[PDB]
Design a protein around this ligand. Structure first.
Ligand SMILES: [Zn+2]
Ligand SMILES: [Zn+2]
Ligand SMILES: [Zn+2]
Ligand SMILES: [Zn+2]
Lengths: 71, 72
DNA sequence: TGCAAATGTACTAGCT
DNA sequence: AAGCTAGTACATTTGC
């Protein structure tokens, strides 16, 4: 049902983790190239369906916390 | 020289405040436009040249705090 | 791909 | 002429 990164409607198990469609694309872009993202808050931004765009840094952090990788 | 909102190179005194071009257009669009801006932290984000895209809600907040206004 | 929103740039209109 | 800003069109970015 739910994406482990942002809590949207998951579309499948992507990169080892149940994740929504946009978190799937986001993580792919993040690992592939630069992910030198800078958080504007305190590195604990709320990553939900609407706010997940706000902070790539915290979102890529949750992606790693959830265990996403290339296997 | 310095935009008092994002610290990008200022473009002039826009709407009462020395600001860059991107903050000028952003402020007018924020006032006159419909937006679903929601902060993901604590309504207290850092706004600089990079992080200004991160949180428009705090950016709009910093705009008003700097004294920006569509009048004179 | 395809479409729309958000953002930023560069320019023009108009004043003083 | 200079020197200024608000408005606006275009380009880019970003996300579905
Ligand atoms: Zn997600
Ligand atoms: Zn963050
Ligand atoms: Zn600015
Ligand atoms: Zn914020």
């Amino acid at each position: 049902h739910m994406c482990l990164v942002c809590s949207d409607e998951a579309s499948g198990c992507h990169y080892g983790v149940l994740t929504c469609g946009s978190c799937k694309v986001f993580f792919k872009r993040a690992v592939e190239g630069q992910h030198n993202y800078l958080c504007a808050g305190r590195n604990d931004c709320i990553i939900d369906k609407i706010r997940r765009k706000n902070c790539p840094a915290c979102r890529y952090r949750k992606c790693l916390q959830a265990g996403m990788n290339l296997e």
